[PDB]
Write a protein that binds this DNA or RNA. Structure first.
Lengths: 97, 101, 135, 77, 356
RNA sequence: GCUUGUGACGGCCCGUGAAAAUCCACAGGAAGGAAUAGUUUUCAUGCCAGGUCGUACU
RNA sequence: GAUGGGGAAGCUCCGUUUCAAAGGCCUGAUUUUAUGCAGGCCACCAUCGAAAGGGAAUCCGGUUAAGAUUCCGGAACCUGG
């Protein structure tokens, strides 16, 4: 499941949280995968698609809002978008999620 | 101890008809009628007061120069700046999506 | 890859030239003593060339086609990057870190960039760049 | 009323040729709180507004009285 | 249905090239005695030269990584007080006070003891061992890049410009107390230059668009000049204190008669490219402009202190010789304190002496 | 401290608490302007003009 | 509360933008008919109704038997050209 994959990446793998820090990693070309929440607004979402498709980065849509995306990565503050800089021991990116 | 009159023929405390008590060069207190306070101009979208624009009564904008009323960005006089930012972002992406359709 | 490059067209978001299309000539990656942030040197156009048609001729067409260029340093946050690209060799040696400041060297830079962008526009190529973004 | 700091700007207003009359004024004041000194104030009647120039030093004041044009009317105290 | 140039001699040919720098010469200064030229270059060195021969007599390397595009030697100026040997150098975010070992004990010790006596917007630091070997006696570390430095006439205070440093874009430093103060509460625009008046207790502050004159004693603004330019680059003040010239990147030089009007008295258009420096002679009725066209233009100006006549400005000579490199030409210039001699700093790696 | 003006907040409603003249800004670009002298009277200064009726006192 | 209208034997009553042809702007060698107006653009509505609602702009000092933000002296501002 998607929560079991992300529970690995937090405890052993590079990542970053929130909108401004991800867009820098998209610009610099470090981000391999990004995870966008459902409840994020559409101008925000459609911007991150456009930054991604220039850089040729894979984009997953988390079925769930920004509160419970925060629960999945395991942080008590809510998070709208998450990016993966480096993969963990588990495979994440190569699977269809 | 010294007390003070309305100068004008209206004797009621209306929104217009207000008073400040002022010490003169004569050395006595006197009323001075304060005009009503200028509200800030707003951004007609986000709905908040917007910077580098003078707070004047609406007739008083006709006296004042252009650089008071404007700011130099496109849509500067009438937009929040952050709300100008959004619609430049939005115009660009929706126009790009129209080719993808 | 890193997509912000010497080819790259972009829309400037903040500050005076907001919603005006520019092209990056020198991307500095991270920072300097002045401008302590990721910043790009760009070369846009302030006043777009107006519409033009079969009816107009000679002198009316020259007035309609006239372009004011500008050049600026700008933050990477204020620049929205764009899939389109434009060739930049006509104003590579012109625009630079030494060129900015020390005025009016800025004016001599804009005269070359004017002669680039108008002459790019005659026999029009990159048609998207010289159309005004409406918002 | 409108103060002027600069000395060059005052000499332009005297030659402007709407200015019918001027007036000079002298005031006793105390500098810091140490000693007295003799201030001057060269005022000039413009059509709209009253331009004025505050000179603190007494030596510079006396040369300024001569530096006025003769055709302009001048009025003491 | 107006006098000819012939009647206005002396004024400056290039007699002497100061050759040696391996990069653009951005700044130069002539010492109080009028015998020693100092230059600062993108090659990372400051050099001192025997003016009539062009012989380099001193070199100190202030930047070991001279290929670094992030920081350079920006501005140098000899202390104006006689016989202390002090050279101020703005480089990156630092100001060094240097006393080169070329003057002897009486002069060098005078400078060193003055600087040592003084023993938070800026920090005053003792030199490291590495800095001692560069003849640095003290360093003032600021938060932002220091683009301009200028001594007060008495040689204790100096003012520096840190563009886009907001409220601390202009700093006043006092050597005797190792004290740095920010004279202003408010930041108005990008500051390009700051200069003390020749004898009045005033500071002139040049932004990109305006020149503001402050009375440091009264702590108030006393005048605001409106040059009508978008890109001012430098100012200089006439030695008798009632006139100013300003250069602009849009090719103009503006003469302001400070008492006459706030707008320019005269607009001079004698350059094909951005003007980088304007400079008055301290004693002779001469001034110059220097531009990115590689040219220096020399002017006569008579000022009438007491009587109701406005300045008489006469162009005298176009000086050519500097090579234009990457759209840059003459980056700085300075007059000899007594002779009709002008020193220029070039993007072409040279400094030059122009004489009669 | 008293009177009063204003600011940013908080409570209340099956109550959420006038309109119009007037003024300004923004988007748009009909078109109009220079190299031998034009464009700007939203920068500055200067010139002229301002009618009818009420006005005492309680 | 007139008008357009409609009621009423009639004094008049209804109605207020309504089932009205309800004016004022641009261009024109409109290229031939040789001394006659051609081609277009714009879209709701009279008026009255507040000396406390809305609203351009003035202050100090002096003065009268009795007047003054209105006279006198000085110092300001607003509107239109």
């Amino acid at each position: 499941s998607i929560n079991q994959k992300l529970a690995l990446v937090i405890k052993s793998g590079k990542y970053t949280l929130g909108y401004k820090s991800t867009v820098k990693s998209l610009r610099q070309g470090k981000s391999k995968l990004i995870i966008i929440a459902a409840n994020t607004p559409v101008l925000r979402k459609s911007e991150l698609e456009y930054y991604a498709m220039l850089s040729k980065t894979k984009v997953y849509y988390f079925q769930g809002g920004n509160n419970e995306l925060g629960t999945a990565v395991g942080k008590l503050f809510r998070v709208g978008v998450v990016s993966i800089l480096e993969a963990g021991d588990s495979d994440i990116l190569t699977t269809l999620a | 101890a010294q007390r003070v009159t309305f100068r004008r023929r209206n004797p009621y405390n209306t929104r217009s008809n207000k008073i400040k008590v002022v010490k003169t060069p004569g050395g006595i207190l006197r009323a001075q009628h304060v005009k009503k306070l200028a509200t800030r101009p707003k951004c007609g979208d986000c709905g908040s007061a917007l910077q580098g624009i003078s707070t004047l009564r609406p007739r008083q904008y006709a006296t004042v120069s252009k650089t008071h009323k404007t700011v130099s960005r496109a849509y500067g006089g009438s937009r929040c700046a952050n709300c100008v930012k959004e619609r430049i972002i939005r115009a660009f992406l929706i126009e790009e999506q129209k080719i993808v359709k | 890859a890193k997509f912000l490059k010497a080819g790259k067209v972009a829309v400037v978001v903040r500050g005076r030239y907001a919603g005006k299309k520019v092209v990056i000539v020198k991307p500095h990656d991270e920072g300097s003593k002045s401008h302590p942030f990721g910043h790009a040197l760009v070369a846009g156009i302030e006043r777009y060339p107006l519409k033009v048609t079969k009816k107009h001729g000679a002198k009316k067409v020259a007035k309609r086609t006239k372009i004011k260029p500008f050049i600026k340093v700008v933050n990477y946050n204020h620049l929205l990057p764009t899939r389109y690209t434009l060739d930049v060799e006509a104003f590579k040696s012109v625009v630079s870190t030494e060129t900015f400041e020390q005025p009016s060297q800025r004016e001599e830079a804009k005269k070359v960039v004017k002669k680039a962008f108008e002459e790019r526009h005659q026999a029009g190529k990159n048609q998207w760049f010289f159309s005004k973004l409406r918002f | 009323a409108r103060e002027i700091t600069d000395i060059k700007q005052f000499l332009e207003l005297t030659r402007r040729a709407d200015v019918k009359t001027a007036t000079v004024k002298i005031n006793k004041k105390l500098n810091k709180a140490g000693k007295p000194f003799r201030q001057t104030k060269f005022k000039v009647r413009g059509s709209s507004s009253l331009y004025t120039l505050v000179i603190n030093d007494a030596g510079k004041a006396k040369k300024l009285i001569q530096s006025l044009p003769p055709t302009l009317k001048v009025n003491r105290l | 249905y107006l006098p000819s140039p012939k009647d206005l001699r002396p004024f400056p040919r290039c007699s002497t090239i100061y050759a040696g720098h391996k990069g653009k010469v951005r700044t130069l200064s002539i010492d109080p005695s009028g015998l020693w030229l100092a230059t600062g270059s993108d090659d990372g060195t400051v050099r001192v030269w025997e003016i009539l021969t062009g012989r380099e007599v001193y070199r100190t390397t202030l930047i070991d990584d001279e290929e670094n595009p992030d920081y350079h030697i920006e501005c140098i100026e000899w202390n104006p007080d006689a016989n202390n040997g002090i050279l101020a150098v703005a480089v990156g975010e630092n100001i060094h006070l240097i006393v080169p070992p070329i003057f002897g004990y009486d002069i060098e010790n005078n400078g060193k003891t003055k600087i040592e006596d003084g023993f938070q917007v800026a920090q005053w630091n003792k030199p490291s061992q590495k800095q001692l070997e560069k003849d640095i006696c003290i360093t003032i570390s600021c938060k932002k890049t220091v683009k301009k430095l200028s001594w007060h006439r008495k040689g204790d205070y100096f003012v520096t410009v840190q563009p886009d440093s907001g409220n601390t874009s202009v700093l006043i430093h006092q050597v005797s107390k190792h004290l740095t103060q920010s004279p202003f509460k408010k930041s108005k625009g990008i500051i390009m230059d700051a200069k003390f008046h020749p004898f009045k207790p005033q500071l002139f502050v040049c932004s990109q668009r305006y020149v503001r004159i402050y009375d440091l004693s009264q702590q108030i603004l006393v005048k605001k000049l409106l040059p009508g330019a978008r890109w001012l680059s430098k100012i200089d003040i006439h030695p008798r204190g009632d006139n100013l010239i300003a250069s602009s990147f849009d090719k103009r030089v503006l003469w302001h008669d400070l008492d006459l009007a706030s707008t320019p008295y005269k607009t001079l258009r004698y350059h094909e490219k951005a003007v980088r420096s304007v400079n008055f002679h301290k004693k002779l009725p001469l001034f110059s402009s220097a531009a990115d066209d590689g040219t220096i233009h020399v002017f006569h100006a008579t000022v009438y202190d007491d009587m109701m006549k406005n300045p008489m400005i006469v162009p005298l000579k176009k000086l050519t010789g500097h090579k234009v490199i990457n759209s840059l030409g003459v980056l700085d210039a300075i007059w000899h304190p007594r002779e009709a001699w002008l020193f220029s700093a070039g993007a072409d790696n040279t400094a030059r002496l122009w004489t009669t």
